[PDB]
């Protein structure tokens, strides 16, 4: 994976924190927001290893960080002998680690394969968590929920044809 | 209003497994699929305790299991003295754990709050994972990816107004 | 049934938010007025499109069905039993026997959901009215947020089809 | 530039999938015929709506922009600086200086994305042709899956607006 596990866990923490605020548990929300902030602010983390260059951020000098990924499949689902043969060869090539050859066989049988990457703008997200922490410290719990929502709103999905 | 962390962990395994079939190790895909299947097949988990009762399933005698939850906020984002006064009171009741009274105060402020629950049909999902395990055993990797996709496709969202 | 007035109103909202940020507030104002008019028709039988039993944030509001889609879940494994079930289901669909067709698929391990998009009617009218006041005051960014609030009221409700 | 032709075609596909499972195959066939005709109509200047630099699965294909929406990210904390930037951005929107307006927001911590929905033209034409063959053979469940495959080719591409 080129997925940043720290960014993935941080955003999962934000989701649970926002729900905690509406279930009368600000203390859990505060602890989770602190965990998320610390996950994104480590000096040892090599964020460049997870960055998506070429995706321009709203903040200058910021970068989008890959924090999750999924596979997207498109096809007709019609079984033909030719498509079954292509899939058999694709499976063969994938077993041998020939990922690029496997994808070529799938694509000629009408299968589209995308990698969906979930992208987090690093400094923009840190700034939103910092705003949330200040509000939590002042017990402005609804407002903290909105700042956390703003962090979630910065996450985008980018889909790219795999091995094309 | 409790989430099955076991079901959520299983479905997260499924997502990683599908991508590994195209982009990582098929051996890791098999291991993740075995783990997801074992988590869902474990009846030491008290599944009924996490079920959503009034949601009819596709299989007879199945149940939807709550495996994730999030908050959805609707409002205009326009500040007024009346609204800020009501939000201040909402925050005070949140601090005292009065989650119902806090929600009544937010509705005075013009805020709509939903809880989104992600629902997993347990036996239907078990069946899809079992199909994927059979395919992976035969090195039918693309087909296994579709069986896992079918598992993901059974997850639905149900949204309900929080504490009305 | 699906409310095409609600469907068109929320489509107008989406286009209006884009128009504001492409430097066309006039187009956004026209579209927001159209959406307001679609949701305030005196002679729309809204109860015909309502989703009762879905509790709203506002007291005595109602959710309106404004869109729908089909969701299919299966494992894509071909067997003789499954192909035979699909053939029977297709024959039932050809005859208009929609309920039997879906039951035949479910018995073969195919899940068919109806995904309904639900609009809270009075809540959405209120959001549009807030956006109109901001547009009148030339508060265009703020109006874009108010329209976003109207969009965030739309929820999805999925039910097994003809179950 | 959004392709209204492509958007209409994909909306037809959604309704067709619903019609198949609500016992109306003739309506689904009519809707699928219309979607195929719209996408095959080369009097539409498809290249004018294409998203350059986005690689498709098929060798000589192109992604067509068929829909777009706005996404706003901010922390909702009112500060004198942000409130002044919103005032300036609103003035630039009113003058049609759309790029300066988004830059003003960006520099005050308000991020605006444009989300574009992208349709791979030849790939989508191919998926509809597959569905047509199935509909002609009365293979209605299979046609529903082939139409689902057409929808699954639509992707979202988000970019900072006028950055």
XYZ file of C-alpha atoms in Angstrom:
654
model
C 0.000 0.000 0.000
C 0.878 3.637 -0.514
C -1.821 4.348 2.080
C -0.949 6.455 5.117
C -2.329 4.469 8.053
C -1.908 7.496 10.330
C -4.164 9.598 8.103
C -6.686 6.768 7.784
C -6.890 6.353 11.571
C -7.058 10.126 12.128
C -10.112 10.523 9.915
C -11.809 7.488 11.462
C -11.201 9.170 14.831
C -12.860 12.357 13.583
C -15.972 10.434 12.510
C -16.345 8.758 15.908
C -15.634 12.049 17.717
C -18.419 13.853 15.859
C -20.904 11.120 16.787
C -19.689 11.177 20.397
C -20.551 14.882 20.646
C -24.201 14.182 19.830
C -24.374 11.229 22.220
C -23.506 13.365 25.224
C -19.864 12.237 25.404
C -17.649 15.304 24.883
C -14.794 13.690 26.820
C -14.512 10.880 24.269
C -14.766 13.438 21.460
C -11.937 15.454 23.009
C -9.664 12.418 23.437
C -10.304 11.293 19.851
C -9.669 14.758 18.423
C -6.373 14.843 20.331
C -5.477 11.409 18.944
C -6.278 12.573 15.402
C -4.248 15.787 15.780
C -1.260 13.838 17.099
C -1.497 11.312 14.254
C -1.105 14.094 11.681
C 1.593 16.110 13.495
C 4.411 13.581 13.942
C 7.850 14.725 12.804
C 9.029 11.177 12.028
C 6.235 10.420 9.543
C 7.532 10.673 5.962
C 4.410 12.142 4.383
C 6.072 12.453 0.968
C 5.951 8.642 0.803
C 2.134 8.922 0.733
C 1.662 12.155 -1.218
C -0.219 12.481 -4.499
C 1.813 15.049 -6.458
C 0.025 16.686 -9.345
C -3.197 17.139 -7.374
C -3.158 20.859 -6.572
C -4.312 21.794 -3.070
C -6.281 24.844 -1.950
C -3.534 25.921 0.482
C -0.205 26.890 -1.070
C 2.574 24.338 -0.468
C 0.088 21.778 0.832
C -0.154 18.206 -0.408
C -2.837 15.565 -0.790
C -2.025 12.397 1.165
C -3.396 8.996 0.143
C -5.305 7.737 3.207
C -7.424 4.947 1.676
C -7.871 3.002 -1.533
C -10.416 0.687 -3.137
C -10.845 -1.073 -6.466
C -13.540 -0.065 -8.932
C -14.775 -2.622 -11.474
C -16.911 -2.016 -14.545
C -18.076 -4.704 -16.955
C -21.208 -6.122 -18.562
C -21.276 -9.362 -16.450
C -22.064 -11.371 -19.590
C -20.343 -14.755 -19.595
C -18.894 -15.735 -22.964
C -16.298 -18.439 -23.680
C -13.914 -15.681 -24.833
C -14.359 -13.634 -21.667
C -13.906 -16.730 -19.508
C -10.665 -17.486 -21.367
C -9.419 -13.930 -20.834
C -10.185 -14.163 -17.114
C -8.379 -17.489 -16.840
C -5.249 -15.988 -18.397
C -5.570 -12.840 -16.280
C -5.690 -14.980 -13.117
C -2.604 -16.920 -14.285
C -0.636 -13.725 -14.849
C -1.736 -12.216 -11.534
C -0.590 -15.338 -9.669
C 2.899 -14.879 -11.174
C 2.912 -11.201 -10.163
C 2.477 -9.987 -13.770
C -0.088 -7.374 -12.778
C 0.290 -5.320 -15.956
C -0.232 -8.342 -18.193
C -3.255 -9.437 -16.152
C -4.894 -6.026 -16.558
C -4.309 -6.046 -20.318
C -6.178 -9.369 -20.598
C -9.070 -8.091 -18.475
C -9.341 -4.855 -20.466
C -9.557 -6.681 -23.786
C -12.483 -8.699 -22.367
C -14.311 -5.451 -21.615
C -13.420 -5.175 -17.909
C -12.543 -1.721 -16.596
C -10.347 -1.563 -13.500
C -9.931 1.651 -11.493
C -8.003 2.333 -8.313
C -9.972 4.775 -6.159
C -7.727 6.763 -3.820
C -9.062 8.807 -0.911
C -6.989 11.978 -0.594
C -6.490 14.149 2.503
C -4.986 17.670 2.234
C -2.486 17.502 5.058
C -2.033 21.072 6.292
C -5.671 21.943 5.579
C -6.769 18.966 7.699
C -4.341 19.811 10.528
C -5.679 23.381 10.577
C -9.268 22.152 10.847
C -8.392 19.835 13.744
C -6.580 22.700 15.488
C -9.716 24.841 15.150
C -11.779 21.972 16.590
C -9.452 21.583 19.572
C -9.705 25.275 20.473
C -13.511 25.021 20.404
C -13.514 21.818 22.459
C -11.352 23.518 25.094
C -13.985 26.269 25.324
C -16.752 23.621 25.499
C -18.216 24.906 22.206
C -19.244 21.376 21.307
C -21.611 22.024 18.403
C -19.101 24.407 16.826
C -16.386 21.774 17.307
C -18.568 19.308 15.406
C -18.723 21.739 12.468
C -14.950 22.227 12.414
C -14.538 18.446 12.432
C -17.090 18.244 9.611
C -14.952 20.709 7.655
C -11.991 18.355 8.006
C -14.100 15.512 6.574
C -15.295 17.748 3.744
C -11.705 18.152 2.532
C -11.359 14.446 1.708
C -11.749 13.724 -2.020
C -11.705 10.568 -4.148
C -9.466 10.258 -7.196
C -9.947 7.350 -9.598
C -7.203 6.240 -11.976
C -7.099 3.415 -14.493
C -4.883 0.756 -12.953
C -1.643 -0.119 -14.782
C -2.832 1.543 -17.986
C -27.299 2.357 19.101
C -24.146 0.227 19.329
C -21.942 -0.679 16.370
C -20.685 -4.217 15.736
C -16.936 -3.612 15.632
C -16.483 -7.232 14.519
C -18.657 -6.758 11.430
C -16.997 -3.424 10.649
C -13.531 -4.978 10.914
C -14.595 -7.822 8.592
C -15.880 -5.447 5.929
C -12.678 -3.393 6.153
C -10.717 -6.628 5.552
C -12.874 -7.227 2.459
C -11.957 -3.837 0.987
C -8.238 -4.435 1.472
C -8.522 -7.979 0.086
C -10.182 -6.822 -3.150
C -7.470 -4.277 -3.850
C -4.709 -6.792 -3.031
C -6.097 -9.065 -5.765
C -5.214 -6.375 -8.323
C -2.470 -4.406 -6.606
C -0.887 -6.489 -3.849
C -0.476 -10.093 -2.786
C -3.179 -12.670 -3.648
C -1.871 -14.635 -0.657
C -2.674 -11.601 1.486
C -6.095 -11.420 -0.160
C -6.745 -15.038 0.844
C -5.612 -14.382 4.419
C -7.795 -11.283 4.717
C -10.802 -13.105 3.256
C -10.310 -16.014 5.684
C -10.154 -13.559 8.586
C -13.288 -11.694 7.465
C -15.161 -14.956 6.996
C -14.057 -16.232 10.420
C -15.117 -12.991 12.107
C -18.589 -13.129 10.547
C -19.041 -16.852 11.279
C -18.169 -16.480 14.984
C -21.370 -16.915 16.975
C -19.625 -15.986 20.219
C -20.365 -12.496 18.917
C -23.890 -11.600 20.084
C -25.038 -10.511 16.626
C -28.693 -10.099 17.596
C -27.614 -7.398 20.070
C -26.449 -5.294 17.086
C -29.371 -6.028 14.756
C -31.678 -3.432 13.223
C -35.057 -5.045 13.883
C -37.530 -3.633 11.348
C -35.421 -3.922 8.186
C -36.616 -6.817 6.024
C -33.775 -8.848 4.502
C -33.446 -10.599 1.155
C -32.839 -14.013 2.686
C -35.423 -15.562 4.948
C -34.585 -15.327 8.649
C -31.610 -12.995 8.153
C -30.859 -9.788 10.048
C -29.234 -6.465 9.242
C -26.368 -5.734 11.648
C -25.315 -2.163 12.464
C -21.607 -2.012 11.589
C -20.955 1.759 11.408
C -22.551 5.084 12.270
C -22.077 8.774 11.441
C -23.798 12.135 12.082
C -25.400 14.222 9.365
C -25.964 17.941 10.022
C -28.357 20.169 8.051
C -28.584 23.906 8.682
C -28.295 27.259 6.932
C -25.042 28.402 8.644
C -26.507 31.876 9.329
C -25.649 33.304 12.750
C -28.347 35.119 14.745
C -28.594 36.077 18.435
C -31.495 33.643 18.941
C -29.480 30.861 17.311
C -26.262 31.519 19.231
C -28.248 31.649 22.476
C -29.822 28.276 21.705
C -26.496 26.720 20.673
C -24.905 27.897 23.929
C -27.636 26.057 25.852
C -27.178 22.988 23.652
C -23.482 22.903 24.556
C -24.299 23.091 28.270
C -26.637 20.089 28.059
C -24.065 18.149 26.007
C -21.592 18.740 28.846
C -24.078 17.272 31.339
C -24.663 14.219 29.128
C -28.254 15.373 28.469
C -28.099 14.223 24.857
C -31.869 14.518 24.334
C -32.174 18.017 25.779
C -29.160 19.111 23.740
C -30.865 17.890 20.562
C -34.048 19.817 21.388
C -31.954 22.961 21.765
C -30.251 22.460 18.401
C -33.627 22.117 16.707
C -34.571 25.466 18.256
C -31.429 26.862 16.621
C -32.614 25.597 13.221
C -30.351 22.529 13.077
C -31.382 19.141 11.707
C -29.477 16.097 12.948
C -29.572 12.584 11.505
C -27.719 9.472 12.576
C -26.582 7.403 9.584
C -26.281 3.673 10.289
C -24.485 1.295 7.931
C -26.240 -2.074 7.887
C -24.822 -5.509 7.018
C -27.125 -8.505 6.218
C -25.340 -11.167 8.193
C -26.142 -14.478 6.482
C -26.164 -12.889 3.022
C -22.676 -11.489 3.706
C -21.452 -14.797 5.143
C -22.655 -16.517 1.958
C -20.775 -14.087 -0.282
C -17.550 -14.526 1.681
C -17.891 -18.312 1.539
C -18.262 -18.102 -2.246
C -15.133 -15.940 -2.396
C -13.193 -18.433 -0.260
C -14.105 -21.258 -2.656
C -12.931 -19.198 -5.648
C -9.676 -18.135 -3.971
C -8.966 -21.791 -3.168
C -9.129 -22.448 -6.941
C -6.943 -19.410 -7.798
C -9.935 -17.746 -9.521
C -8.828 -14.313 -8.383
C -10.943 -12.035 -10.581
C -14.071 -14.065 -9.763
C -13.279 -13.884 -6.046
C -13.017 -10.102 -6.368
C -16.587 -10.006 -7.711
C -17.882 -12.242 -4.910
C -16.297 -9.842 -2.412
C -17.786 -6.911 -4.329
C -21.185 -8.561 -3.955
C -20.577 -8.664 -0.207
C -19.860 -4.913 -0.216
C -22.887 -4.257 -2.412
C -25.214 -5.622 0.302
C -24.268 -2.902 2.821
C -26.964 -0.215 3.017
C -27.315 3.091 4.840
C -30.292 3.908 7.039
C -30.701 7.459 8.343
C -32.909 8.400 11.307
C -33.627 11.671 13.106
C -31.595 11.618 16.314
C -33.632 11.554 19.564
C -37.030 12.738 18.347
C -44.187 7.319 -6.831
C -41.331 9.778 -7.433
C -41.974 13.514 -7.080
C -40.567 15.058 -10.255
C -41.114 18.493 -8.696
C -38.820 17.588 -5.797
C -36.338 15.971 -8.177
C -36.201 19.100 -10.358
C -35.948 21.390 -7.331
C -32.871 19.637 -5.943
C -31.302 19.531 -9.414
C -31.872 23.297 -9.595
C -30.120 23.661 -6.218
C -27.055 21.771 -7.442
C -26.794 23.955 -10.564
C -27.402 27.141 -8.564
C -24.488 26.429 -6.210
C -22.182 25.903 -9.173
C -23.471 29.065 -10.881
C -22.662 31.241 -7.851
C -19.016 30.190 -7.907
C -18.721 30.568 -11.669
C -19.607 34.251 -11.289
C -23.258 33.952 -12.371
C -25.404 34.940 -9.366
C -28.275 35.888 -11.700
C -28.577 32.303 -12.929
C -28.347 31.095 -9.326
C -31.144 33.434 -8.229
C -33.404 32.266 -11.070
C -32.760 28.601 -10.262
C -33.333 29.113 -6.532
C -36.647 30.849 -7.295
C -37.612 27.940 -9.551
C -36.784 25.435 -6.812
C -38.821 27.449 -4.304
C -41.781 27.508 -6.690
C -41.543 23.762 -7.327
C -41.787 23.028 -3.584
C -44.629 25.493 -2.908
C -47.130 24.538 -5.615
C -50.585 24.889 -4.093
C -51.983 21.991 -6.158
C -49.293 19.353 -5.583
C -50.641 16.315 -3.735
C -47.495 15.811 -1.675
C -49.031 12.955 0.344
C -49.021 10.979 -2.926
C -45.193 10.960 -2.758
C -44.667 10.872 1.012
C -42.738 8.232 2.957
C -44.774 7.801 6.162
C -43.159 6.298 9.213
C -39.934 8.181 8.477
C -39.726 10.664 11.346
C -38.497 14.159 10.463
C -36.489 16.694 12.445
C -39.327 19.211 12.162
C -42.588 18.383 13.891
C -45.334 17.389 11.411
C -42.961 17.507 8.417
C -42.784 14.613 5.952
C -40.172 12.959 3.752
C -40.972 13.007 0.022
C -39.604 10.440 -2.437
C -37.722 12.466 -5.069
C -35.566 9.810 -6.748
C -35.063 6.058 -6.860
C -32.500 3.541 -8.070
C -32.029 -0.249 -8.152
C -29.313 -1.919 -6.092
C -28.230 -5.501 -6.913
C -26.117 -7.766 -4.687
C -24.936 -11.276 -5.569
C -21.680 -13.219 -5.714
C -21.620 -13.617 -9.552
C -20.997 -17.377 -9.307
C -22.774 -19.203 -12.135
C -24.524 -22.469 -11.284
C -27.246 -24.444 -13.075
C -29.729 -23.643 -10.271
C -28.974 -19.939 -10.514
C -29.159 -19.785 -14.307
C -32.485 -21.645 -14.152
C -33.800 -19.178 -11.562
C -32.709 -16.200 -13.688
C -34.454 -17.658 -16.747
C -37.669 -18.061 -14.742
C -37.365 -14.539 -13.310
C -36.930 -13.123 -16.825
C -40.069 -14.915 -18.003
C -41.969 -13.417 -15.060
C -40.635 -9.942 -15.907
C -41.757 -10.375 -19.517
C -45.316 -11.044 -18.278
C -45.259 -8.043 -15.931
C -45.155 -10.255 -12.817
C -42.674 -7.985 -11.075
C -43.178 -9.414 -7.570
C -42.704 -13.046 -8.558
C -39.599 -12.128 -10.556
C -37.945 -10.535 -7.535
C -38.859 -13.434 -5.278
C -37.369 -15.902 -7.763
C -34.106 -13.912 -7.775
C -33.993 -13.737 -3.963
C -34.434 -17.512 -3.755
C -31.353 -17.799 -5.994
C -29.192 -15.614 -3.740
C -29.717 -12.304 -5.583
C -30.580 -9.287 -3.435
C -32.543 -6.508 -5.128
C -32.968 -3.253 -3.202
C -34.954 -0.162 -4.108
C -32.935 2.915 -3.065
C -35.275 5.875 -2.440
C -34.006 9.443 -2.101
C -36.042 11.328 0.508
C -36.524 15.094 0.822
C -37.910 16.620 4.060
C -40.436 18.995 2.566
C -40.834 21.841 5.072
C -37.184 21.644 6.119
C -36.114 22.008 2.484
C -38.536 24.899 1.916
C -37.021 26.637 4.954
C -33.494 26.161 3.627
C -34.460 27.574 0.238
C -36.086 30.570 1.933
C -32.911 31.219 3.937
C -30.870 31.044 0.726
C -33.229 33.505 -0.975
C -32.739 36.122 1.743
C -28.959 35.791 1.432
C -29.104 36.032 -2.369
C -31.200 39.197 -2.074
C -28.506 40.713 0.163
C -25.791 39.704 -2.377
C -24.290 37.344 0.248
C -23.321 34.805 -2.363
C -20.887 32.589 -0.446
C -23.304 32.402 2.478
C -26.116 31.512 0.080
C -23.978 28.709 -1.329
C -23.680 27.281 2.195
C -27.424 27.649 2.818
C -28.140 25.711 -0.384
C -25.645 23.068 0.746
C -27.704 22.759 3.925
C -30.742 21.985 1.781
C -28.779 19.278 -0.023
C -27.631 17.758 3.278
C -31.267 17.104 4.179
C -31.632 14.493 1.421
C -31.286 10.927 2.723
C -31.283 7.480 1.109
C -33.616 4.707 2.308
C -33.120 1.224 0.864
C -35.745 -1.535 1.015
C -35.894 -5.010 -0.497
C -37.980 -4.707 -3.655
C -41.484 -6.217 -3.396
C -40.556 -8.102 -0.217
C -18.554 22.695 -20.261
C -20.876 19.885 -19.130
C -22.352 17.507 -21.742
C -26.121 17.642 -21.282
C -26.448 14.845 -23.845
C -24.300 12.462 -21.834
C -26.043 13.396 -18.590
C -29.470 12.764 -20.117
C -28.322 9.380 -21.435
C -27.071 8.217 -18.030
C -30.284 9.436 -16.376
C -32.193 7.317 -18.923
C -30.059 4.338 -17.906
C -31.037 4.801 -14.243
C -34.756 4.867 -15.072
C -34.380 1.891 -17.423
C -32.909 -0.273 -14.667
C -35.865 0.667 -12.474
C -38.365 -0.046 -15.247
C -36.964 -3.558 -15.790
C -37.634 -4.556 -12.184
C -40.993 -2.767 -11.933
C -42.498 -4.997 -14.622
C -42.075 -2.615 -17.583
C -39.495 -4.071 -19.995
C -40.969 -2.150 -22.943
C -40.291 1.166 -21.205
C -36.779 0.007 -20.284
C -36.148 -0.886 -23.940
C -37.368 2.543 -25.078
C -35.152 4.283 -22.517
C -32.126 2.169 -23.429
C -32.681 2.839 -27.142
C -32.740 6.557 -26.369
C -29.579 6.436 -24.261
C -27.715 4.478 -26.943
C -28.843 6.891 -29.648
C -27.814 9.949 -27.627
C -24.335 8.552 -26.937
C -23.853 7.371 -30.552
C -24.844 10.761 -32.016
C -21.630 12.220 -33.431
C -23.284 15.531 -34.286
C -22.586 16.116 -30.593
C -19.054 17.571 -30.428
C -17.902 15.142 -27.743
C -14.254 16.283 -27.831
C -15.375 19.761 -26.701
C -16.579 18.237 -23.402
C -13.677 15.821 -22.900
C -11.397 15.915 -19.851
C -7.843 15.955 -21.241
C -5.107 14.077 -19.437
C -7.462 11.576 -17.775
C -6.507 8.137 -19.093
C -9.362 5.744 -19.893
C -9.394 1.960 -19.713
C -9.821 1.707 -23.494
C -6.871 2.749 -25.649
C -8.449 5.478 -27.788
C -11.254 6.605 -25.460
C -11.987 9.867 -23.650
C -13.724 10.922 -20.437
C -16.681 13.262 -21.077
C -17.720 15.725 -18.382
C -21.428 15.032 -17.815
C -22.077 16.677 -14.430
C -20.438 18.986 -11.905
C -20.999 20.078 -8.308
C -19.365 22.344 -5.723
C -17.702 21.227 -2.481
C -16.806 23.679 0.316
C -14.313 22.959 3.134
C -13.911 25.305 6.104
C -14.054 25.215 9.894
C -17.041 27.602 10.313
C -15.162 29.790 12.822
C -16.024 33.447 12.247
C -12.910 35.646 12.333
C -12.588 39.268 11.173
C -10.191 38.125 8.441
C -12.479 35.439 7.029
C -15.524 37.724 7.190
C -13.662 40.408 5.225
C -12.476 37.845 2.664
C -16.049 36.611 2.180
C -17.190 40.207 1.586
C -14.517 40.677 -1.075
C -15.242 37.290 -2.645
C -18.943 38.170 -2.884
C -18.120 41.447 -4.625
C -15.940 39.626 -7.153
C -18.695 37.072 -7.785
C -21.126 39.924 -8.460
C -18.664 41.372 -10.995
C -18.177 37.927 -12.557
C -14.503 37.740 -11.435
C -15.015 34.082 -10.605
C -11.321 33.229 -10.371
C -10.483 36.102 -8.030
C -13.465 35.156 -5.877
C -12.289 31.581 -5.351
C -8.713 32.749 -4.756
C -9.939 35.189 -2.098
C -11.716 32.357 -0.251
C -8.715 30.025 -0.654
C -6.372 32.609 0.907
C -8.684 32.930 3.935
C -8.849 29.180 4.602
C -12.046 28.372 2.682
C -11.355 25.582 0.184
C -13.617 25.219 -2.852
C -13.517 22.122 -5.065
C -15.317 21.428 -8.313
C -16.383 17.790 -8.580
C -16.761 16.664 -12.196
C -18.580 13.469 -13.163
C -16.754 11.755 -16.020
C -18.194 9.294 -18.539
C -15.843 7.186 -20.727
C -17.555 7.582 -24.084
C -16.663 4.451 -26.065
C -16.643 2.274 -22.939
C -20.172 3.465 -22.121
C -21.355 2.966 -25.729
C -20.018 -0.589 -25.513
C -21.873 -1.279 -22.266
C -25.168 -0.058 -23.731
C -24.654 -2.184 -26.861
C -24.187 -5.208 -24.613
C -27.397 -4.353 -22.762
C -29.267 -3.951 -26.053
C -28.303 -7.454 -27.170
C -29.527 -8.819 -23.844
C -32.809 -6.888 -24.024
C -33.370 -8.259 -27.535
C -33.025 -11.802 -26.153
C -35.418 -11.039 -23.248
C -32.533 -11.504 -20.780
C -33.844 -8.800 -18.482
C -31.885 -9.521 -15.291
C -28.648 -9.725 -17.294
C -29.521 -6.477 -19.082
C -29.971 -4.838 -15.673
C -26.415 -5.881 -14.736
C -24.991 -4.630 -18.053
C -26.640 -1.253 -17.475
C -25.207 -1.288 -13.939
C -21.800 -1.805 -15.532
C -22.363 1.296 -17.644
C -23.118 3.314 -14.495
C -20.032 1.918 -12.748
C -17.825 3.482 -15.427
C -18.774 6.983 -14.217
C -16.090 8.475 -11.938
C -15.712 11.685 -9.934
C -12.693 13.978 -10.419
C -12.366 16.818 -7.896
C -10.136 19.825 -8.575
C -9.572 23.082 -6.708
C -11.778 25.553 -8.551
C -9.818 28.121 -10.626
C -6.624 27.337 -8.693
